[PDB]
PDB file of C-alpha atoms in Angstrom:
ATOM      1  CA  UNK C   1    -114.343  29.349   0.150  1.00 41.94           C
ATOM      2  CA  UNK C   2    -115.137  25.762   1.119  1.00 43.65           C
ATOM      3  CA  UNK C   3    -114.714  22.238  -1.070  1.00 45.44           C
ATOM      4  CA  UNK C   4    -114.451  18.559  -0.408  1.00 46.14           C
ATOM      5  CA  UNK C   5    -111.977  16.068  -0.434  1.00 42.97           C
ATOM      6  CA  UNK C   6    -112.746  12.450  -0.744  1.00 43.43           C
ATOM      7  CA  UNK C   7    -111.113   9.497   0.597  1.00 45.52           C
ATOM      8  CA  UNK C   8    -111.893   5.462  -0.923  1.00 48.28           C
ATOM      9  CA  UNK C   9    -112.942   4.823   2.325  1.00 48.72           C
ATOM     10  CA  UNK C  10    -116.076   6.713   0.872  1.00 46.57           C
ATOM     11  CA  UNK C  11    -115.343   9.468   3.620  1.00 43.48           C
ATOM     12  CA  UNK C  12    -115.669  12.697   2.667  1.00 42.34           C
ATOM     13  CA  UNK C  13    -114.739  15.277   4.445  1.00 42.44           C
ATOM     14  CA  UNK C  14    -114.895  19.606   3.692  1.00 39.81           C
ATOM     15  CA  UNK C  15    -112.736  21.898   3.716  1.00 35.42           C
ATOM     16  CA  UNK C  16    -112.237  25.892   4.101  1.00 34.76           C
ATOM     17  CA  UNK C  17    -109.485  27.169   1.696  1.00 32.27           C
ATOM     18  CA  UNK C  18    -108.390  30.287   0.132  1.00 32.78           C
ATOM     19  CA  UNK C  19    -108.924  30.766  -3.833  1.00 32.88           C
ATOM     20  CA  UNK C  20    -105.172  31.531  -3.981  1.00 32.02           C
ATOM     21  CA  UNK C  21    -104.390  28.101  -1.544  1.00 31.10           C
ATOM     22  CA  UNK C  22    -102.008  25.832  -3.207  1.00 28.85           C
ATOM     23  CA  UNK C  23    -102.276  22.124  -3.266  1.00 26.43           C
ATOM     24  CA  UNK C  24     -99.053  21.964  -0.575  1.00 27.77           C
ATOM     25  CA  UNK C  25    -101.343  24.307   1.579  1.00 26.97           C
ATOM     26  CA  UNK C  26    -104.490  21.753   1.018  1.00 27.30           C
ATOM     27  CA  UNK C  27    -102.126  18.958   1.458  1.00 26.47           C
ATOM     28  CA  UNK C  28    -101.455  20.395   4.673  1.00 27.24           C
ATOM     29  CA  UNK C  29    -104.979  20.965   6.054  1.00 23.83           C
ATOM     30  CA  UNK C  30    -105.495  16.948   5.015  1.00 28.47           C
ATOM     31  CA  UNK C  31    -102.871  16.381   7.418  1.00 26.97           C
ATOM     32  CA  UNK C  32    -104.304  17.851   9.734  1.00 27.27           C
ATOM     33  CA  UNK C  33    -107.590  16.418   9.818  1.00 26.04           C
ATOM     34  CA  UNK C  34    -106.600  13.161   8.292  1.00 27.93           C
ATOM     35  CA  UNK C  35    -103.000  13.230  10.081  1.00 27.76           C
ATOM     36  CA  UNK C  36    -101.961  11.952   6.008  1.00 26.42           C
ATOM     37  CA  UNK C  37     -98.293  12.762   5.334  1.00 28.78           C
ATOM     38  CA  UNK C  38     -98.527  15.643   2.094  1.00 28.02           C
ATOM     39  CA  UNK C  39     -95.496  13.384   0.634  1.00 29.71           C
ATOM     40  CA  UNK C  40     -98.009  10.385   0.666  1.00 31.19           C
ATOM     41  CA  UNK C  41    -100.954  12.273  -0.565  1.00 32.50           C
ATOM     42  CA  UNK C  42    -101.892  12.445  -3.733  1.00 33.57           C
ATOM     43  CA  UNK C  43    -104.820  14.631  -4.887  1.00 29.19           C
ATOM     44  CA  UNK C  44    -107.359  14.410  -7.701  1.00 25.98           C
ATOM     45  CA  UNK C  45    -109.158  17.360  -9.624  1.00 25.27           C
ATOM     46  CA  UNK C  46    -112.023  16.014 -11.530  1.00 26.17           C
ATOM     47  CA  UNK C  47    -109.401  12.940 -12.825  1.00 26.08           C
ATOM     48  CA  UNK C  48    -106.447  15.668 -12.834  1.00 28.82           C
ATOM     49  CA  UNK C  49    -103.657  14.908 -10.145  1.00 29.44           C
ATOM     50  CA  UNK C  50    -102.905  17.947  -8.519  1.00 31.97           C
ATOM     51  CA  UNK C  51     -98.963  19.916  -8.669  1.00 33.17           C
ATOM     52  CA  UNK C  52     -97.917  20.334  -5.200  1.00 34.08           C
ATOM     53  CA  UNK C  53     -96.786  24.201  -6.322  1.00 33.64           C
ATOM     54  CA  UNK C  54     -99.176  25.271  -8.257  1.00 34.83           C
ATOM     55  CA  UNK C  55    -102.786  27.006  -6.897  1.00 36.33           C
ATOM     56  CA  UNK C  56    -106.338  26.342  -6.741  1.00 33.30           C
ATOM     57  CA  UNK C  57    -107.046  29.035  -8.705  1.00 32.00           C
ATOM     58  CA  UNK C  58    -104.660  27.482 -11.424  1.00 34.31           C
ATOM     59  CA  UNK C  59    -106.929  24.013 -11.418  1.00 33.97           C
ATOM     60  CA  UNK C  60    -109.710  26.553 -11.911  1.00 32.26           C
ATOM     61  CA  UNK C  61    -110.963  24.503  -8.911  1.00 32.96           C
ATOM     62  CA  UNK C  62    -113.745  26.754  -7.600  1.00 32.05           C
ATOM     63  CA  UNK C  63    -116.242  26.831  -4.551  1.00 34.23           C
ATOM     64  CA  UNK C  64    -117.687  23.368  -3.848  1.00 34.03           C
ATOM     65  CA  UNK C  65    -115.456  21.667  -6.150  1.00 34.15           C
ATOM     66  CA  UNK C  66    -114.530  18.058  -4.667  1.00 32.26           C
ATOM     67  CA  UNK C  67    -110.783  16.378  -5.371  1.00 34.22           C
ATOM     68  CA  UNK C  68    -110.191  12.785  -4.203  1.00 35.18           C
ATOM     69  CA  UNK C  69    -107.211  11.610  -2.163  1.00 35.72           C
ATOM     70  CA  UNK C  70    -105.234   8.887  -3.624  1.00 36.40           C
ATOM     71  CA  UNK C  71    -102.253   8.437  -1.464  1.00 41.10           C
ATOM     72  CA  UNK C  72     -98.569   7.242  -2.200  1.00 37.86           C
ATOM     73  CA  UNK C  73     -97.799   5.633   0.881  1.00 41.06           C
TER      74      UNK C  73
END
């Protein structure tokens, strides 16, 4: 799989995941890449904010889908 994250700054950035990936384990590869603390991230599904436990396949968020970073920081 692959999607895209999006940050106010306009940046937006991909991302490879798994179908079955939850949002801690997305979370995680934002931290990563944008070195954002999960506990200050905060992420959007078409206007929908993410459940840390639940998966992407619960959001029925599918290939090429994009969810926007708010963060709670």
């Amino acid at each position: 799989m692959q999607i895209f994250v999006k940050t106010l700054t306009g940046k937006t950035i991909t991302l490879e995941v798994e179908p079955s990936d939850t949002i801690e384990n997305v979370k995680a590869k934002i931290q990563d890449k944008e070195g954002i603390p999960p506990d200050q991230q905060r992420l959007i599904f078409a206007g929908k904010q993410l459940e840390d436990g639940r998966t992407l396949s619960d959001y029925n968020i599918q290939k090429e889908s994009t969810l926007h970073l708010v963060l709670r920081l």
